[PDB]
Amino acid sequence: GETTDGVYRVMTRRLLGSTQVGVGVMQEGVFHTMWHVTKGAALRSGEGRLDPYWGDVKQDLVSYCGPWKLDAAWDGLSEVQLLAVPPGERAKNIQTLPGIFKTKDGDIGAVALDYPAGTSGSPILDKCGRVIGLYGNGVVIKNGSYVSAITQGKRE
Amino acid sequence: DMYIERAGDITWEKDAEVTGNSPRLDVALDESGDFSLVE
Ligand SMILES: O=C(NC1CCOCC1)[C@H](Nc1ccc2c(c1)CNC2)c1cc(Cl)cc2[nH]ncc12
């Protein structure tokens, strides 16, 4: 159905009314989202059907219709924008300077912004509008606030 | 069944709301894809 590039809401009709469970990025005919949003299940776009193509629970990512297409990376210095798509609310750009997640396997960027769980999968962008990762997998710190990793996949 | 709905273009907005801090955190990632704070 709808294959236009852009940001999309991932909805369900299983719970009360219509519920937004996450968000995704359509790019080069491929739908990219977080694994915990869909759990690998098939998606619908009007009459069209999107089937999972690649996914990994540890990276918390999943692609539909083709391999992962997003490869831009945070430069480690510049401010970025979270294109937040909250449930029942309009898409909104929020600019912030990322922090760092230090892990035994290396450093990852981190965006310290609080949004409902249904915002998971919203893209993080660089100054050229390129998707450097998805927001929606992270940690809750001391004051009860949320810090998301800048989760990016590997392009083949 | 899950479905998708378009919500907008992917573009950088000049003069967007600037907010949020930049913490340096020690974290661990388990096999289930869950991050946790290491202290
Ligand atoms: O980061 C999250 N989950 C916790 C946060 C700290 O404890 C461990 C994992 C939420 N998403 C999510 C849920 C299920 C799984 C995963 C990610 C990956 N593995 C399965 C989540 C998203 C958003 Cl956008 C906001 C949020 N606030 N609190 C939570 C929250």
| Structure tokens that stand for A93 in this block | 């750009």
H helices, E strands: number in chain A: 1, 15
Query: What's A67's DSSP letter?
Result: S
CA–CA gap between residue A24 and residue B6 (Å, rounded): 9
CATH number at residue A45: 2.40.10.120
Q: Do B4 and A50 touch (CB under 8 A)?
A: yes
Q: How many Cα atoms occupy the beta-carbon half-sphere of A134 within 13 Å?
A: 32
Residues found in chain A = 156
- CA A48 from chain center: how many Å? 22
CA–CA gap between residue A130 and residue A126 (Å, rounded): 5
Q: Based on the structure, what is the number of domains in chain A?
A: 2
Q: Are residues A46 and A99 in the same domain?
A: no
* Block residue for tokens 């924008």: A81
Instruction: Say if A1 falls within a structural domain.
Output: no
**Read out DSSP for A109-139?**
EEEB----GGGTT-EEE-TTS-EEEE---EE
Resolution of this deposited model, Å:
2.0
CA–CA gap between residue B39 and residue A21 (Å, rounded): 31
* Block residue for tokens 């998971």: A120
Distance from the CA of A138 to the center of ligand 1, in angstroms? Answer: 6
Query: B29 pairs with which residues across the strands?
Result: B35
Q: Whose CA is nearest to atom 14 of ligand 1?
A: A36
Structure solved using which method? X-ray
CA–CA gap between residue B32 and residue A57 (Å, rounded): 6
Q: Are residues A102 and A127 in the same domain?
A: yes
Instruction: Say if A71 falls within a structural domain.
Output: no
Q: Are residues A87 and A144 in the same domain?
A: yes
Among the listed residues A30, A14, A32, the one whose alpha carbon sits nearest the alpha carbon of residue A22: A32
Q: Are residues A100 and A57 in the same domain?
A: no
Provide the domain limits for residue A122: 80-149
CA–CA gap between residue A39 and residue A56 (Å, rounded): 10
Q: Are residues A85 and A55 in the same domain?
A: no
Instruction: Say if A75 falls within a structural domain.
Output: no
- Chain B CA closest to residue A61: B33
* Facing residue for A31 by CB, picked from B4, B25, B28: B4
Which of A47, A96, A151 would best serve as a mutation to test chain B binding (most B beta carbons within 10 A)?
A96
Among the listed residues A75, A72, A144, A87, the one whose alpha carbon sits nearest the alpha carbon of residue A112: A144
Measured CA to CA in angstroms, residue B36 lies from A12, A134, B26 at distances of: 29, 18, 9
Query: By three-state DSSP, how is residue B15 classified?
Result: coil
Q: With contact defined as beta carbons under 8 Å apart, do A68 and A27 qualify?
A: no
